[PDB]
Design a protein around this nucleic acid. Structure first.
Ligand code: MG
Ligand code: ZN
Ligand code: ZN
Ligand code: ZN
Lengths: 112, 10, 107, 171, 97, 654, 87, 267, 166
DNA sequence: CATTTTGCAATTAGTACTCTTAGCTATGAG
RNA sequence: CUAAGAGUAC
DNA sequence: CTCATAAATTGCAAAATG
């Protein structure tokens, strides 16, 4: 019910000035904000506190503190986020990178 | 805390 | 289920968790005047069995933490008597598709 | 001693190399790199078993490179020396410091400190050899040696052997 | 010209990951740095012409890897190590997803 | 030439493991111990051995290779040194954490206060994530001030079970600046907890205790939070007048030498304490100069010293200023002007910018001739080439290479050439609030000094022509080029996922013109009809039968505009009060690509859902929609040019 | 790897090539053509590597497979030949 | 802030919407798995109108006269009347339409009939009409059994999730239920035979086009829906008794205990 | 695990710590676990010969010591190319110190040593070293101490010496 | 058993252009 | 060269 | 005479009592 109320609030904000945004965008926003069981705010004290990787948590706010806490806690960052691969300069597993392109020798031979 | 993030306390 | 008028003394809360499998749940009469589950905002909550939870995690390849969370203090969670680890199925009247089924794990 | 073990090698193929003979190229390039090679982790590697159908898998195009990274898995026959192992061999050279014995593909250097006091070097003989009261160790002579110390190097594995123990020497 | 944060975000929304990587690595700063598999630090002395890689302390010379990271990233990791934080870089998965 | 070949295997970072440096690890990885605070030797022409700029950490001059790796400044990552501190000091970033840990473990026996015998410890240790475990353990053990050498039995509170507790009483620990002072209950005893004793008590913490606290056996033990061997970043980290970190390290070394000499030569305890506090302050301001309460370590010029934390945090820090967003090559920026004679997906590129921004095209048997001709043309005329990268990594600049003669190109080389027509280029107007504000356009080289873009495509960019500037990024590979053309192309972005409706439309003059063109009164004679028909590039070549045949052949505006609309489009919108007959000519009915009736205006050709743009792009495709944009703009702009539209003061008069 | 690889007989993903899959296939194939890869289709005079890749994909003559990673780490191998390019 | 919060959300190959940790945000994107750019506003005819109007529009009876059909509508117009099998088919089809009417009235309390759905059926019907030259006077070549079986098969062919187990099949039905309601609302036997007058080949072509368009409107795995949503919410914010606009957006994203204008609604 | 640095006991054949990756059970390329088999000199020679003749036949479609050495040299030169110095040395070492001739005898030896139910490393060493008595075998291979009875080892080495030919 | 009360700093649209100034001051001593 | 500052464009 | 140093969010542990 909190998620439904949050979506209604966001939709009223969007529709106050007459603009229209598709349902699924606001639905994604409110589902991200309430996927933890409570209203996770879009703030350094909100989404940035979830254990989602130090390298992407620090990219938003409180960088050095996040690095210190990760070092103290020996956190293992799996480099699944976009910000981790952006920092490390490697193709993020998004869009064109959400998969791997490989080669079929049998098909290549079957062509000729 | 701090400030920020007095003390505690004071 | 224990239903109280106003409050419970702190010295009584400590002995509320009895020997298992007996579980005691406290509810306030004031908080039980209106049934929250009949609200149009509140979707349909259905507790899943252990077999259903296992099948869910098998089919969606999920782990325990990768499910959406529902606190083991939410009014609906208290209502249906959820214990930690039990997954509820949420039936919602979506506006892009007629029906949407979500699953929330109790934490 | 001789074993057979699972090994995996990462080969990178250029875009111009993808033709109907890609499997042949991968099979040949696995050879000439590991056949008869030596590494510190697994000792010597002599040959590859089951060449009929070696597991090559799919390969993977490196992004922005185009070169494909195949992880070829194979069965390789290896000769890893181990500490305190008795093995036969052939003497091929002798010197003041000791003598070299040919064990498989490797040469084990038995130092002069690790022979009985009766055995002594003799350079007067042509070729020089090791002469004792009951036996003589010369070139192309069978000898049993126990390895007691090994240092792990990659390009050339080295072992330390001895014949000081009972029933060690020329057969 | 600055390829700012929200430009990167727009390229993420477009889903073009390789173009974003090209923007942030080839077009700006691509730095090849060596690490060892034992300790993920960049403390690997490299002698490329002599073909000798060695991380002191770990006593290893064949357990080395090279990675392509932005020089800004290398400098960040160096400033982290200089501030008593070890950003060990590992090239294999020690845990399942 | 880049970086020379390396035989080390190439992998991509999969898991980044954090932790803390062990002092023995710092001693092992360091290649040169730093002992003297000076940077240069007495000759001032070489880097002092044993100083902060030891050549074993990396050469400071281009002409000199790094003494350790025998490589130049282009290749050397820079190797750390180590300063062996005279006495242990707190890590400024971990002080609070250190406090919490020393608030959880007995300060004499070095064991955790409350083992599993306590009631809530089972629940506390049952927590999975390390941070929440530590939070619970701290908030439960912070109010316990006794080691509890004997505790009541878990079975029943009758007998006493003795654990490995020394029975002392833990103090209340506060922080006074950079030090922690403990007040023991008076049998209060207030004394400064020396870093040596805290390090000792941390080294006594059992493996189980601190791994329950959230630390790790291998990567981060609690006793590593106290500094004893400070790493020294190489001059690459602090390039040189010297950098601020160089001065801070010089101050740290000076304080360390002062304390060491006072220790060795013997000194009063007060002077030793003062030297220790100065060392702690210098270390803390080296790692964090924004410590609340304490004054900032001012630099020799009178300004605050740039600490490492200051170098990392902020918009201009490493993360946000150099990693999340960084300055990139192969980009241009200039003023933008409208051009009704450009396609929707086309962008006008000044000849100079095209001559500057370059694309590397790999030499292929299919493009040997044209790239060879570009190489022959050189970089001072357009089209041309600017560089040739050989298979050996050597670069040939077309300037100063004509003396050597013509270049015989070989397959597999690269020709880095001027961006030519139909090159997919990312085009952006900042702030760039959404993905449509960054779209792939096709290059059309123009002989003037401004970017030129279609009037419609300004709507997604929110771009005017009153001095706006826009950015142009050129992909440098076939892969980025291809995904840019196939995912970020302007036609593919016509319909926005933002509101499931087209984001572009007919705007400004054209829109006004089209309203004037589709009125019932608008009739067009034969000659103007012929011109307007020819102005549609994909006109099928047949003149429509005029709406009026006698006594004078007149085409209506709707008839001519229907040529622009692709064949097979049905649209039917009913405005307020319209009937199947249109007394007001409002509404819109288009049948098989012919406008049956209705004035064409913003509701039809504008960026509205269900309009002509949406229907055309959903039925025929994005390419046909872009073609429709071009055709409509061309015909309507020609008609308005030859009809004219003005406004004056009289238009504001009633 | 055997546990990860979902067998071809029970792949549960869409048989239609996604826009990202097509974009990366075209990019990779155009890059290989630019680096002198063999061509399996007859050429009608085309010289752009991108349009060469498009013509190869039109008649499904690209010798690559997509390895679609599920969130759990398991992957499905869809050969470009059996993927249907609809968009 | 919005972009950073939503930067790691992605639609994975199992159609779930998961972040960098693998946590499921949505078990299917947008709760229907549809790409946003392929969504158009369309009218649900079942929900609108009166009970008498709904009966006149959809109810078909082969045994009475109030809701009978004109025999000239289709080829076998004088043969179907008095039948029992096809009467059973129409009875279940009308019962399904009544169920859809009740369902849609439950989904939308206000009864709004125009909602965004993936495939625009009206445009496909018009395309078939203009391609096959429907003359509106010739009796239709179609048969009722063809129409009913074709609609049911088309509903079975709209696959969002390709899995092969009960949970995935239930999720697929939940994902396509509203579009199937729209499809039944448009492709009713009464409406197909009388209002649109589709022929046999025209009906087959309409079914094929609807299937193709629906399969084309399914969201693409790997779509960065998180950044898309963040930007699609932030861009209208720049164009911007109770607080609204940017201050209210700030009050919502920064979930604040105290807000300027807390108002409560009581019915 | 990913423990940085590594402390390990020294490799020792007598202690039977062949290595962390030289353990008894190893996961094969098919994903299942198989025992770490150790090939004796004659068995290893026969395995190498089988592999080389398989390669020769694949390329074609696509006893006394002197004659055997000539045949193996010809086959090695025909099958493979270069970098075979180590392979040649190992092959001549195996042919010179060849304890068995053909497949039947090595199969009998391996099945007998399997019936003894002993470690593959130990049985391969027994098949490799040409021991005579029991205490001699015990002092040659320390790993056999307090593992097998004296009489059984003596008699099985008696049959192994009996199976020695040429 | 029940309240109860208190003191404040860090972080917070994008890019992009031009120009101007300044880099421990003064005093001791070899 | 770096840092600080001022003014300015959209 | 010239180098070296003097808006709005958060995030609570005390200390006192009857
Ligand atoms: Mg402007
Ligand atoms: Zn290391
Ligand atoms: Zn160096
Ligand atoms: Zn104690």
């Amino acid at each position: 019910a909190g998620r439904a109320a949050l979506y209604k609030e966001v939709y009223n904000v969007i529709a106050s000035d007459g603009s229209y945004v598709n349902y699924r965008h606001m639905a994604l926003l409110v589902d991200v904000m309430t996927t933890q069981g409570g209203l996770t705010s879009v703030t350094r004290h909100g989404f940035n506190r979830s254990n989602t990787g130090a390298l992407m948590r620090c990219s938003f706010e409180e960088t050095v503190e996040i690095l210190f806490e990760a070092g103290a806690s020996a956190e293992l960052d799996d480099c699944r986020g976009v910000s981790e691969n952006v920092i490390l300069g490697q193709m993020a597993p998004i869009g064109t990178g959400a998969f791997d392109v490989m080669i079929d020798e049998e098909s290549l031979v079957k062509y000729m | 805390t701090x400030p920020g993030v007095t003390x505690p306390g004071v | 289920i224990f239903v109280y008028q106003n409050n419970i003394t702190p010295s009584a809360m400590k002995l509320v968790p009895s020997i298992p499998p007996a579980t005691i749940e406290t509810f306030n009469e004031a908080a039980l005047v209106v049934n929250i589950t009949h609200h149009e905002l509140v979707p349909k909550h259905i507790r899943l069995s252990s077999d259903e939870k296992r099948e869910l995690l098998k089919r969606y390849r999920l782990k325990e933490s990768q499910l959406p969370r529902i606190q083991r203090a939410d009014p609906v969670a208290l209502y249906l008597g959820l214990k930690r680890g039990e997954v509820v199925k949420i039936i919602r009247k979506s506006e892009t598709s007629g029906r949407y089924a979500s699953y929330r794990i109790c934490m | 001693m001789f074993f057979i073990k699972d090994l995996s090698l990462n080969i990178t193929l250029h875009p111009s190399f993808f033709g109907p003979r890609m499997k042949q190229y991968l099979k040949t390039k696995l050879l000439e790199e590991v056949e008869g090679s030596c590494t510190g982790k697994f000792g010597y590697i002599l040959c590859v078993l089951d060449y009929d159908n070696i597991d090559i898998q799919r390969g993977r195009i490196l992004p922005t490179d185009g070169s494909a990274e195949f992880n070829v898995k194979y069965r390789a026959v290896v000769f890893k020396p181990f500490k305190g192992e008795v093995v036969d061999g052939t003497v091929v050279s002798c010197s003041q410091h000791g003598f070299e014995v040919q064990v498989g593909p490797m040469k084990v250097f038995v130092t002069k400190h690790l022979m009985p006091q009766d055995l002594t070097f003799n350079a007067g003989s042509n070729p020089p050899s090791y002469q004792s009261s009951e036996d003589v160790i010369t070139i192309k002579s069978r000898i049993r040696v126990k390895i007691e110390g090994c240092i792990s190097q990659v390009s050339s594995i080295h072992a330390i052997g001895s014949i000081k123990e009972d029933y060690l020497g020329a057969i | 010209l600055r390829f700012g944060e929200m430009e990167r975000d727009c390229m993420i929304a477009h889903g073009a990951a390789s173009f974003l990587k090209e923007r942030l690595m080839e077009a700006s700063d691509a730095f090849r740095v060596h690490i060892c598999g034992i300790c993920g630090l960049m403390t690997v002395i490299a002698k490329l012409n002599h073909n000798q890689f060695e991380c002191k302390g770990c006593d290893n010379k064949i357990d080395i890897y090279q990675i392509h990271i932005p020089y800004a990233a290398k400098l960040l990791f160096q400033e982290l190590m200089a501030m008593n934080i070890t950003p060990r870089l590992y090239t294999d998965r020690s845990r399942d997803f | 030439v880049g970086q020379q070949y390396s035989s080390a295997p190439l992998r991509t970072v999969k898991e980044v493991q954090f932790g803390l440096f062990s002092p023995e690890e710092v001693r092992a990885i360091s290649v040169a111990k730093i002992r003297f605070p000076e940077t240069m030797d007495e000759t001032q022409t070489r880097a002092k051995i044993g100083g902060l700029n030891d050549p074993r950490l990396g050469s400071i001059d281009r002409n000199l290779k790094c003494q350790t790796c025998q490589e130049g400044m282009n290749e050397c990552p820079g190797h750390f040194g180590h300063i062996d501190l005279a006495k242990p000091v707190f890590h400024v970033g971990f002080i609070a954490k250190i406090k919490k840990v020393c608030e959880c473990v007995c300060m004499h026996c070095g064991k955790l206060l409350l083992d599993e015998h306590n009631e809530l410890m089972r629940q506390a240790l049952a927590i999975k994530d390390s941070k929440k475990r530590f939070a619970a353990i701290w908030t439960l053990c912070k109010t316990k001030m006794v080691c509890e050498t004997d505790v009541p039995s878990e079975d029943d509170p009758t007998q006493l079970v003795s654990r490995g507790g020394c029975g002392n009483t833990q103090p209340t620990i506060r922080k006074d600046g950079l030090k922690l002072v403990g007040s023991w209950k008076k049998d209060p005893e207030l004394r400064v907890l020396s870093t040596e004793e805290i390090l000792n008590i941390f080294k006594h913490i059992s493996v189980k205790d601190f791994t329950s606290l959230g630390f790790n056996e291998v990567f981060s033990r609690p006793e590593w939070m106290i500094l004893t061997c400070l790493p020294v970043p190489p001059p690459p980290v602090r390039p040189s007048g010297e950098d601020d970190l160089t001065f801070k390290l010089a101050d740290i070394l000076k304080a360390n030498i002062s304390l060491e000499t006072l220790e060795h030569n013997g000194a009063p305890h007060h002077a030793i304490e003062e030297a220790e506090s100065l060392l702690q302050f210098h270390v803390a301001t080296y790692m964090d100069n924004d410590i609340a309460g304490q004054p900032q370590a001012l630099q020799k010029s009178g300004r605050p010293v740039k600490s490492i934390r200051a170098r990392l945090k902020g918009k201009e820090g490493r993360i946000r200023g150099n990693l999340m967003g960084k300055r990139v090559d192969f980009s241009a920026r200039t003023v933008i002007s409208g051009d009704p004679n450009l396609e929707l997906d086309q962008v006008g590129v000044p000849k100079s910018i095209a001559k500057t921004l370059t694309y590397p095209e790999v030499v292929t048997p299919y493009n040997i001739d044209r790239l060879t001709q570009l190489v022959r043309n050189g970089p001072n005329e357009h089209p041309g080439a600017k560089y040739v990268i050989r298979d050996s990594g050597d670069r040939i600049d077309l300037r100063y290479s004509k003396r050597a003669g013509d270049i015989q190109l070989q397959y597999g080389w690269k020709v880095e050439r001027h961006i030519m027509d139909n090159d997919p280029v990312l085009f952006n107007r900042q702030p760039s609030l959404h993905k449509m504000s960054m779209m792939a356009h096709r290059v059309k080289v123009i002989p003037y000094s401004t970017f030129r873009l279609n009037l419609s495509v300004t709507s997604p960019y929110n771009a005017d022509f009153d001095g706006d500037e826009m950015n142009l990024h050129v992909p440098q590979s076939e892969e980025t080029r291809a995904e840019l053309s196939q995912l970020c192309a302007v036609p593919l972005q016509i319909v926005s996922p933002q509101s499931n409706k087209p984001c572009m439309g007919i705007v400004q003059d054209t829109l006004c013109g089209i309203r004037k063109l589709t009125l019932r009164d608008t009739f067009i004679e034969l000659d103007q009809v012929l011109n307007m028909l020819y102005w549609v590039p994909d006109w099928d070549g047949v003149i429509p039968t005029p709406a009026i045949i006698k006594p004078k052949p007149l085409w209506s505006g709707k008839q001519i505009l229907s040529v622009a609309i692709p064949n097979g489009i049905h649209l039917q919108r009913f405005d307020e009060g319209t009937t199947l007959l249109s007394p007001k000519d409002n509404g819109m009915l288009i049948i098989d690509g012919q406008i049956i009736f209705g004035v064409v205006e913003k509701k039809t050709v504008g960026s509205s859902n269900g309009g002509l743009i949406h229907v055309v792009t959903r039925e025929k495709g994005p390419q046909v929609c872009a073609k429709l944009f071009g055709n409509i703009q061309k015909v309507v702009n020609f008609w308005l040019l030859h009809n004219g539209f003005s406004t004056g003061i009289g238009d504001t008069i009633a | 790897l055997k546990e990860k690889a979902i067998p071809k007989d029970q792949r549960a993903t869409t048989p239609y090539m996604t826009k990202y899959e097509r974009a990366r296939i075209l990019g990779t194939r155009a890059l290989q053509i630019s680096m002198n890869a063999p061509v399996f289709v007859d050429l009608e005079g085309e010289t752009d590597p991108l349009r060469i890749a498009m013509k190869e994909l039109a008649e499904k003559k690209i010798p690559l497979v997509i390895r679609r990673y599920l969130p759990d780490g398991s992957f499905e191998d869809w050969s470009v030949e059996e993927l249907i390019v609809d968009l | 802030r919005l972009v950073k919060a939503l930067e790691d959300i992605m639609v994975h190959y199992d159609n779930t919407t998961r972040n960098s940790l693998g946590n499921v945000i949505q078990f299917i994107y947008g709760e229907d798995g549809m790409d946003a750019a392929h969504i158009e506003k369309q009218s649900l005819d079942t929900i609108g109108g009166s009970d008498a109007a709904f009966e006149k529009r959809y109810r078909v009876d082969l045994l009475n006269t109030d809701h009978t059909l004109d025999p000239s509508l289709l080829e076998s117009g004088s043969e179907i009347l008095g039948d029992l099998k096809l009467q059973v088919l129409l009875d279940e089809e009308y019962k399904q339409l009544v169920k859809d009417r009740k369902f849609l009235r439950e989904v939308f309390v206000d009864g709004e009939a125009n909602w965004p759905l993936p495939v625009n059926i009206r445009r496909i019907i018009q395309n078939a009409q203009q391609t096959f030259h429907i003359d509106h006077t010739k009796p239709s070549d179609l048969t009722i059994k063809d129409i009913v079986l074709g609609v049911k098969d088309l509903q079975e062919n709209l696959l969002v999730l390709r899995g092969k187990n009960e949970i995935i099949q239930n999720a697929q039905r939940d994902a396509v239920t509203l579009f199937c309601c729209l499809l039944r609302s448009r492709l009713a036997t009464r409406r197909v035979l009388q209002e649109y007058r589709l022929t046999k080949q025209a009906f087959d072509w309409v079914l094929s086009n609807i299937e193709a368009q629906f399969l084309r409107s399914v969201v693409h795995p790997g779509e960065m829906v998180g950044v898309l949503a963040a930007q699609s919410i932030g861009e209208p914010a720049t164009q911007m008794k109770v607080t609204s606009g940017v201050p209210r957006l700030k009050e919502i994203l920064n979930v604040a205990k105290n807000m300027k204008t807390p108002s409560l609604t009581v019915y | 695990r990913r423990r940085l640095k590594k402390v390990e006991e020294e490799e020792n054949a007598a202690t039977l710590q062949l290595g962390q990756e030289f353990q008894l059970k190893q996961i094969n390329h098919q994903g299942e676990e198989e025992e770490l088999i150790a090939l004796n000199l004659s068995e290893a020679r026969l395995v190498i010969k089988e592999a080389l003749v398989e390669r020769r036949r694949a390329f074609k479609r696509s006893e006394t010591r002197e004659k055997e050495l000539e045949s193996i040299d010809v086959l090695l030169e025909q099958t493979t190319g270069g970098n075979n110095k180590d392979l040649k040395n190992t092959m001549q070492y195996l042919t010179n110190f060849s304890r068995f001739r053909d497949q039947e005898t090595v199969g009998a030896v391996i099945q007998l040593l399997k019936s003894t139910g002993l470690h593959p490393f130990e049985v391969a060493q027994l098949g490799s070293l040409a021991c005579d008595t029991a205490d001699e075998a015990k002092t040659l291979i320390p790993s056999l101490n307090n593992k097998i009875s004296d009489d059984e080892l003596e008699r099985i080495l008696k049959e192994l010496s009996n199976l020695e030919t040429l």
